[PDB]
Amino acid sequence: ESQPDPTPDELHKSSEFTGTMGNMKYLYDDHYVSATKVMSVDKFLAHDLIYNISDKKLKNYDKVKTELLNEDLAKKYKDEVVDVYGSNYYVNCYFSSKDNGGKTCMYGGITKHEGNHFDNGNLQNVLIRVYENKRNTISFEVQTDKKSVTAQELDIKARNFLINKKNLYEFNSSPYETGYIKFIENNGNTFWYDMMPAPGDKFDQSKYLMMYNDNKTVDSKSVKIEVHLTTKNG
Ligand SMILES: [Zn+2]
């Protein structure tokens, strides 16, 4: 059932990352694709869905392709009226089955619209407890209008806050060596994501965001979230 917590040696270390940390910051700093009540209009590969979603802010795209874990998930949502929320990227983002208004890519981030909102039309607050060197230092709430929300949406909102409040990610590096965000569902199931880039000198945005392809959702009203960081080394 539950994924065991991170073993000490498996967590990505920022001291072992030689690329530009600002490329990780870019994915969570007031950065996200949003849409309500849309239906896919095309596909590229068997596991992805393309939607007509325009960029309200910077006007950088009008088409969004989201890749999912497998063909089953893609077929499930293909003709569904859904809402979308996720982190997009442009580097190594391609369409055209031959030759197939900007375009952008993402992973998962989709939920059915019908029956997924609160009866009184209010927003649900989700508590995020932050731990620094095993000590709970601060806690803050993020908001969502979805009863069943993708873990991706909550993670993004959490990191956006931490970037501003705790300088989670900066241009060169991070004041933290290690970091992971853990979700705890009211059924006892737990899972986590490594918040640091893979070792090396070149951050691969597409490959990192791929972890959201399972389109994992949680109950916003009951889920618990813990962010565990370490400055550990120094
Ligand atoms: Zn909706």
Coordinates of N, CA and C in Angstrom, one line a residue, residues 33-213:
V33 N -0.6 26.1 -15.4 CA -1.6 26.1 -16.4 C -2.9 25.9 -15.7
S34 N -4.0 26.6 -16.0 CA -5.3 26.5 -15.4 C -6.4 26.6 -16.4
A35 N -7.4 25.8 -16.2 CA -8.6 25.7 -17.1 C -9.7 25.0 -16.5
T36 N -10.9 25.4 -16.8 CA -12.1 24.8 -16.2 C -13.1 24.4 -17.3
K37 N -13.7 23.2 -17.2 CA -14.6 22.7 -18.1 C -14.2 22.6 -19.5
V38 N -13.1 22.0 -19.8 CA -12.6 21.8 -21.1 C -12.6 20.3 -21.5
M39 N -12.5 20.0 -22.8 CA -12.6 18.6 -23.3 C -11.5 18.5 -24.3
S40 N -10.7 17.4 -24.2 CA -9.6 17.2 -25.2 C -10.1 17.3 -26.6
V41 N -9.2 17.8 -27.5 CA -9.6 17.9 -28.9 C -8.6 17.2 -29.8
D42 N -7.6 16.6 -29.3 CA -6.6 15.9 -30.1 C -5.6 15.1 -29.2
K43 N -4.8 14.2 -29.9 CA -3.8 13.4 -29.2 C -2.5 13.4 -30.1
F44 N -1.4 13.0 -29.5 CA -0.2 12.9 -30.2 C 0.2 11.4 -30.0
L45 N 0.7 11.1 -28.8 CA 1.1 9.7 -28.4 C -0.2 9.1 -27.8
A46 N -0.2 7.8 -27.6 CA -1.3 7.1 -27.0 C -1.7 7.5 -25.6
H47 N -0.8 8.0 -24.8 CA -1.1 8.4 -23.4 C -1.3 9.9 -23.1
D48 N -1.4 10.7 -24.2 CA -1.5 12.1 -23.9 C -2.8 12.7 -24.5
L49 N -3.2 13.9 -24.0 CA -4.4 14.6 -24.4 C -4.0 16.0 -24.7
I50 N -4.5 16.6 -25.7 CA -4.3 18.0 -26.1 C -5.6 18.8 -25.9
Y51 N -5.4 20.0 -25.3 CA -6.6 20.8 -25.0 C -6.4 22.2 -25.5
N52 N -7.5 22.9 -25.8 CA -7.4 24.3 -26.3 C -7.4 25.2 -25.0
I53 N -6.3 25.5 -24.5 CA -6.2 26.3 -23.3 C -5.3 27.5 -23.6
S54 N -5.8 28.7 -23.4 CA -5.0 29.9 -23.7 C -4.3 30.5 -22.4
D55 N -3.2 31.1 -22.6 CA -2.4 31.7 -21.6 C -2.9 33.1 -21.3
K56 N -3.7 33.2 -20.2 CA -4.3 34.5 -19.8 C -3.2 35.6 -19.5
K57 N -2.2 35.2 -18.8 CA -1.1 36.2 -18.4 C -0.2 36.6 -19.6
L58 N 0.9 35.9 -19.8 CA 1.9 36.2 -20.8 C 1.5 35.9 -22.2
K59 N 0.3 35.3 -22.4 CA -0.1 35.0 -23.8 C 0.9 34.1 -24.6
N60 N 1.5 33.1 -23.9 CA 2.5 32.3 -24.5 C 2.0 31.0 -25.2
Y61 N 0.7 30.7 -25.0 CA 0.2 29.4 -25.6 C -1.3 29.4 -25.7
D62 N -1.8 28.5 -26.6 CA -3.2 28.4 -26.8 C -3.6 26.9 -26.9
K63 N -2.5 26.0 -26.8 CA -2.7 24.6 -26.9 C -1.8 23.9 -25.8
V64 N -2.4 23.0 -25.0 CA -1.7 22.4 -24.0 C -1.8 20.8 -24.1
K65 N -0.7 20.2 -24.1 CA -0.6 18.7 -24.2 C -0.2 18.1 -22.8
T66 N -1.0 17.3 -22.2 CA -0.7 16.7 -21.0 C -0.5 15.2 -21.2
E67 N 0.7 14.7 -20.7 CA 1.0 13.3 -20.8 C 0.6 12.6 -19.6
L68 N 0.0 11.4 -19.7 CA -0.4 10.6 -18.6 C 0.4 9.3 -18.5
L69 N 0.3 8.6 -17.3 CA 1.1 7.4 -17.1 C 0.9 6.3 -18.1
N70 N -0.3 6.1 -18.6 CA -0.6 5.1 -19.6 C -1.8 5.4 -20.5
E71 N -2.1 4.5 -21.4 CA -3.3 4.6 -22.3 C -4.6 4.6 -21.6
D72 N -4.7 3.8 -20.5 CA -6.0 3.7 -19.8 C -6.4 5.1 -19.3
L73 N -5.5 5.8 -18.6 CA -5.8 7.1 -18.1 C -6.2 8.1 -19.2
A74 N -5.5 8.0 -20.3 CA -5.8 8.9 -21.4 C -7.3 8.7 -22.0
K75 N -7.6 7.4 -22.2 CA -9.0 7.1 -22.7 C -10.0 7.5 -21.7
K76 N -9.7 7.3 -20.4 CA -10.7 7.7 -19.3 C -11.1 9.1 -19.4
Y77 N -10.2 10.0 -19.6 CA -10.5 11.4 -19.7 C -10.8 12.1 -21.0
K78 N -10.4 11.4 -22.1 CA -10.5 11.9 -23.5 C -11.8 12.7 -23.7
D79 N -13.0 12.1 -23.4 CA -14.3 12.8 -23.7 C -14.9 13.4 -22.5
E80 N -14.2 13.5 -21.4 CA -14.7 14.1 -20.2 C -14.5 15.6 -20.1
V81 N -15.5 16.2 -19.5 CA -15.4 17.7 -19.3 C -14.6 17.7 -18.0
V82 N -13.4 18.2 -18.1 CA -12.5 18.3 -16.9 C -11.9 19.7 -16.6
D83 N -11.3 19.8 -15.4 CA -10.7 21.0 -15.0 C -9.2 20.7 -15.1
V84 N -8.3 21.6 -15.3 CA -6.9 21.4 -15.4 C -6.0 22.3 -14.5
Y85 N -5.0 21.7 -13.9 CA -4.1 22.5 -13.1 C -2.7 21.7 -13.0
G86 N -1.7 22.4 -13.5 CA -0.3 21.7 -13.5 C 0.8 22.7 -13.9
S87 N 2.0 22.2 -13.7 CA 3.2 23.0 -14.1 C 3.6 22.6 -15.5
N88 N 3.7 23.6 -16.4 CA 4.1 23.4 -17.8 C 5.6 23.7 -18.1
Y89 N 6.0 23.2 -19.2 CA 7.4 23.4 -19.7 C 7.4 23.6 -21.2
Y90 N 8.5 24.1 -21.7 CA 8.6 24.3 -23.1 C 9.8 23.6 -23.7
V91 N 10.9 23.5 -23.0 CA 12.1 22.8 -23.5 C 11.8 21.3 -23.7
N92 N 12.0 20.9 -24.9 CA 11.7 19.5 -25.3 C 10.3 19.1 -25.2
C93 N 9.4 20.1 -25.7 CA 8.0 19.9 -25.7 C 7.6 19.9 -27.1
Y94 N 7.2 18.7 -27.6 CA 6.8 18.6 -29.0 C 5.5 17.9 -29.4
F95 N 4.9 18.4 -30.4 CA 3.7 17.9 -31.0 C 4.0 17.4 -32.4
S96 N 3.1 17.4 -33.3 CA 3.2 17.0 -34.7 C 3.5 15.5 -34.9
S97 N 2.5 14.8 -35.4 CA 2.6 13.4 -35.7 C 3.3 13.3 -37.1
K98 N 3.4 14.4 -37.7 CA 4.0 14.5 -39.1 C 4.2 16.0 -39.2
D99 N 3.2 16.8 -38.8 CA 3.2 18.3 -38.9 C 2.0 18.7 -38.1
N100 N 1.3 17.8 -37.4 CA 0.2 18.1 -36.6 C -0.9 18.8 -37.4
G101 N 0.2 31.2 -32.4 CA -0.4 30.2 -31.5 C 0.6 29.2 -30.9
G102 N 1.1 29.6 -29.7 CA 2.1 28.8 -29.1 C 1.6 27.5 -28.5
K103 N 2.5 26.6 -28.1 CA 2.1 25.3 -27.5 C 3.0 25.1 -26.2
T104 N 2.4 24.3 -25.3 CA 3.2 24.0 -24.0 C 2.8 22.6 -23.5
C105 N 3.7 22.0 -22.7 CA 3.5 20.7 -22.3 C 3.4 20.6 -20.7
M106 N 2.8 19.5 -20.3 CA 2.7 19.2 -18.8 C 2.3 17.7 -18.6
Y107 N 2.2 17.3 -17.4 CA 1.9 15.9 -17.0 C 0.7 15.9 -16.1
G108 N -0.2 14.9 -16.2 CA -1.3 14.7 -15.3 C -2.1 16.0 -15.1
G109 N -2.5 16.3 -13.9 CA -3.2 17.6 -13.6 C -4.6 17.7 -14.0
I110 N -5.3 16.6 -14.3 CA -6.7 16.6 -14.7 C -7.7 16.0 -13.8
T111 N -8.9 16.6 -13.6 CA -9.9 16.1 -12.7 C -11.3 16.4 -13.4
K112 N -12.2 15.5 -13.2 CA -13.6 15.7 -13.8 C -14.2 16.9 -13.1
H113 N -14.9 17.7 -13.9 CA -15.6 18.9 -13.3 C -16.8 18.6 -12.5
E114 N -17.8 17.8 -13.1 CA -19.0 17.5 -12.5 C -18.8 16.8 -11.1
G115 N -19.6 17.2 -10.1 CA -19.6 16.7 -8.8 C -18.3 16.8 -8.0
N116 N -17.4 17.7 -8.5 CA -16.1 17.8 -7.8 C -15.9 19.2 -7.1
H117 N -17.0 19.9 -6.8 CA -16.9 21.2 -6.1 C -17.7 21.2 -4.8
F118 N -17.5 22.1 -3.9 CA -18.2 22.2 -2.7 C -19.6 22.8 -2.8
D119 N -20.6 22.1 -2.2 CA -22.0 22.5 -2.2 C -22.2 24.0 -1.8
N120 N -21.5 24.5 -0.8 CA -21.7 25.8 -0.4 C -20.8 26.8 -1.2
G121 N -20.1 26.2 -2.2 CA -19.2 27.0 -3.1 C -18.0 27.6 -2.4
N122 N -17.6 27.1 -1.2 CA -16.5 27.7 -0.5 C -15.2 27.0 -0.9
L123 N -14.1 27.5 -0.5 CA -12.8 26.9 -0.8 C -12.3 26.1 0.4
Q124 N -11.6 25.0 0.1 CA -11.0 24.2 1.1 C -9.6 24.5 1.4
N125 N -9.3 24.7 2.7 CA -7.9 25.0 3.1 C -7.2 23.7 3.4
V126 N -5.9 23.6 3.0 CA -5.1 22.4 3.3 C -3.9 22.9 4.0
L127 N -3.7 22.3 5.2 CA -2.5 22.7 6.0 C -1.2 22.0 5.6
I128 N -0.2 22.8 5.5 CA 1.1 22.3 5.1 C 2.1 22.6 6.2
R129 N 2.6 21.5 6.8 CA 3.5 21.6 7.9 C 5.0 21.5 7.4
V130 N 5.8 22.5 7.6 CA 7.2 22.5 7.2 C 8.1 22.1 8.2
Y131 N 9.0 21.2 7.9 CA 10.0 20.7 8.9 C 11.4 21.0 8.4
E132 N 12.2 21.6 9.2 CA 13.6 22.0 8.9 C 14.5 21.3 9.9
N133 N 15.3 20.3 9.4 CA 16.2 19.6 10.2 C 15.4 18.9 11.3
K134 N 14.3 18.2 10.9 CA 13.4 17.5 11.8 C 12.6 18.3 12.7
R135 N 12.7 19.6 12.6 CA 11.9 20.5 13.5 C 10.8 21.2 12.7
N136 N 9.6 21.2 13.3 CA 8.5 21.9 12.6 C 8.7 23.4 12.9
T137 N 9.0 24.1 11.9 CA 9.3 25.6 12.0 C 8.1 26.5 11.6
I138 N 7.4 26.2 10.5 CA 6.3 26.9 10.1 C 5.2 26.1 9.5
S139 N 4.0 26.6 9.5 CA 2.9 25.9 8.9 C 2.0 26.9 8.2
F140 N 1.5 26.6 7.0 CA 0.7 27.5 6.3 C -0.4 26.8 5.4
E141 N -1.4 27.5 5.1 CA -2.5 26.9 4.3 C -2.5 27.3 2.9
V142 N -2.9 26.3 2.0 CA -3.1 26.6 0.6 C -4.5 26.4 0.3
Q143 N -5.1 26.9 -0.7 CA -6.5 26.7 -1.0 C -6.8 26.1 -2.4
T144 N -7.9 25.3 -2.4 CA -8.4 24.7 -3.6 C -9.9 24.6 -3.6
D145 N -10.5 24.7 -4.8 CA -11.9 24.6 -4.9 C -12.4 23.2 -5.3
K146 N -11.5 22.3 -5.3 CA -11.8 20.9 -5.7 C -11.9 20.0 -4.5
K147 N -12.9 19.1 -4.5 CA -13.0 18.1 -3.4 C -12.0 17.1 -3.5
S148 N -11.8 16.6 -4.8 CA -10.7 15.6 -5.1 C -9.8 16.4 -6.0
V149 N -8.6 16.8 -5.4 CA -7.6 17.6 -6.1 C -6.3 16.8 -6.4
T150 N -5.7 17.1 -7.6 CA -4.5 16.4 -7.9 C -3.4 16.8 -6.9
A151 N -2.5 15.9 -6.5 CA -1.5 16.2 -5.6 C -0.6 17.2 -6.2
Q152 N -0.5 17.2 -7.5 CA 0.3 18.2 -8.3 C -0.1 19.6 -7.9
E153 N -1.4 19.9 -7.9 CA -1.9 21.2 -7.6 C -1.5 21.7 -6.2
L154 N -1.6 20.8 -5.2 CA -1.3 21.2 -3.9 C 0.2 21.4 -3.7
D155 N 1.0 20.5 -4.3 CA 2.5 20.6 -4.3 C 2.9 22.0 -4.9
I156 N 2.4 22.3 -6.1 CA 2.8 23.5 -6.7 C 2.5 24.7 -5.8
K157 N 1.3 24.8 -5.3 CA 0.9 25.9 -4.4 C 1.8 26.0 -3.2
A158 N 2.2 24.8 -2.7 CA 3.0 24.8 -1.5 C 4.4 25.3 -1.8
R159 N 5.0 24.8 -2.9 CA 6.3 25.3 -3.3 C 6.4 26.8 -3.7
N160 N 5.3 27.3 -4.2 CA 5.2 28.7 -4.6 C 5.3 29.6 -3.4
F161 N 4.7 29.1 -2.3 CA 4.7 29.9 -1.0 C 6.1 29.8 -0.4
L162 N 6.7 28.6 -0.4 CA 8.0 28.4 0.2 C 9.2 29.1 -0.6
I163 N 9.0 29.3 -1.9 CA 10.0 30.0 -2.7 C 10.0 31.4 -2.2
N164 N 8.9 32.1 -1.9 CA 8.8 33.4 -1.5 C 9.2 33.6 0.0
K165 N 8.6 32.7 0.8 CA 8.8 32.8 2.3 C 10.1 32.2 2.8
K166 N 10.6 31.1 2.1 CA 11.8 30.5 2.6 C 12.9 30.4 1.5
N167 N 12.7 31.1 0.4 CA 13.7 31.0 -0.7 C 14.1 29.6 -1.0
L168 N 13.0 28.7 -1.0 CA 13.2 27.3 -1.3 C 14.2 27.1 -2.5
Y169 N 14.0 27.8 -3.6 CA 14.9 27.7 -4.7 C 15.3 29.1 -5.1
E170 N 16.6 29.3 -5.5 CA 17.1 30.6 -5.9 C 17.7 30.3 -7.3
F171 N 18.3 31.4 -7.9 CA 18.9 31.2 -9.2 C 20.1 30.2 -9.2
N172 N 21.1 30.4 -8.4 CA 22.2 29.5 -8.4 C 21.9 28.2 -7.8
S173 N 21.5 28.2 -6.5 CA 21.2 26.9 -5.8 C 20.1 27.1 -4.8
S174 N 20.1 26.3 -3.7 CA 19.1 26.4 -2.7 C 19.8 26.4 -1.3
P175 N 19.1 27.1 -0.3 CA 19.7 27.1 1.0 C 19.5 25.7 1.7
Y176 N 18.8 24.8 1.0 CA 18.6 23.5 1.5 C 19.4 22.5 0.7
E177 N 19.8 21.4 1.4 CA 20.6 20.3 0.8 C 19.6 19.3 0.3
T178 N 18.6 18.9 1.1 CA 17.7 17.9 0.8 C 16.2 18.3 1.1
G179 N 15.3 17.7 0.4 CA 13.9 18.1 0.6 C 12.8 17.2 -0.1
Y180 N 11.8 16.8 0.6 CA 10.7 16.0 0.0 C 9.4 16.4 0.6
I181 N 8.3 16.3 -0.2 CA 7.0 16.7 0.2 C 6.2 15.4 0.3
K182 N 5.6 15.1 1.5 CA 4.9 13.9 1.8 C 3.4 14.1 2.0
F183 N 2.6 13.3 1.3 CA 1.1 13.4 1.5 C 0.7 12.2 2.4
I184 N -0.3 12.5 3.2 CA -0.8 11.5 4.1 C -2.3 11.5 4.0
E185 N -2.9 10.5 3.3 CA -4.3 10.4 3.1 C -5.1 9.8 4.3
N186 N -6.4 10.1 4.4 CA -7.1 9.7 5.5 C -7.4 8.2 5.5
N187 N -6.9 7.5 4.6 CA -7.0 6.0 4.5 C -5.7 5.4 5.0
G188 N -4.8 6.2 5.4 CA -3.5 5.7 5.8 C -2.4 5.7 4.8
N189 N -2.7 5.8 3.5 CA -1.8 5.7 2.5 C -0.9 7.0 2.5
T190 N 0.4 6.7 2.2 CA 1.4 7.9 2.2 C 2.3 7.8 0.9
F191 N 2.7 8.9 0.4 CA 3.6 9.0 -0.7 C 4.3 10.3 -0.7
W192 N 5.4 10.4 -1.4 CA 6.2 11.6 -1.4 C 7.0 11.9 -2.7
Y193 N 7.4 13.1 -2.9 CA 8.1 13.5 -4.1 C 9.4 14.2 -3.6
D194 N 10.5 13.9 -4.3 CA 11.8 14.5 -4.0 C 11.8 15.9 -4.6
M195 N 11.9 16.9 -3.8 CA 11.9 18.3 -4.2 C 13.2 18.9 -4.8
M196 N 14.2 18.1 -4.9 CA 15.5 18.5 -5.4 C 15.8 17.9 -6.8
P197 N 16.5 18.6 -7.6 CA 16.9 18.1 -8.9 C 17.9 17.0 -8.9
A198 N 17.9 16.1 -9.9 CA 18.8 14.9 -10.0 C 20.2 15.5 -10.1
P199 N 21.2 14.7 -9.6 CA 22.6 15.1 -9.7 C 23.1 15.3 -11.1
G200 N 24.0 16.2 -11.3 CA 24.6 16.5 -12.6 C 24.7 18.0 -12.9
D201 N 24.9 18.3 -14.1 CA 25.0 19.7 -14.5 C 23.9 20.3 -15.4
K202 N 22.9 19.5 -15.7 CA 21.8 19.9 -16.6 C 20.5 19.5 -16.1
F203 N 19.6 20.4 -15.6 CA 18.3 20.0 -15.1 C 17.4 19.7 -16.3
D204 N 16.7 18.6 -16.2 CA 15.7 18.2 -17.2 C 14.3 18.4 -16.7
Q205 N 13.7 19.5 -17.1 CA 12.4 19.9 -16.6 C 11.3 18.8 -16.9
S206 N 11.3 18.4 -18.2 CA 10.3 17.4 -18.6 C 10.4 16.1 -17.8
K207 N 11.7 15.6 -17.6 CA 11.9 14.4 -16.9 C 11.5 14.5 -15.4
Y208 N 11.7 15.7 -14.8 CA 11.4 15.9 -13.4 C 9.9 15.9 -13.2
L209 N 9.2 16.7 -14.1 CA 7.7 16.8 -14.0 C 7.0 15.5 -14.3
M210 N 7.7 14.6 -14.9 CA 7.1 13.3 -15.3 C 6.5 12.6 -14.1
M211 N 7.0 12.9 -12.9 CA 6.5 12.2 -11.7 C 5.0 12.5 -11.5
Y212 N 4.4 13.5 -12.1 CA 3.0 13.8 -11.9 C 2.1 13.1 -13.0
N213 N 2.7 12.2 -13.8 CA 1.9 11.6 -14.8 C 0.9 10.6 -14.3

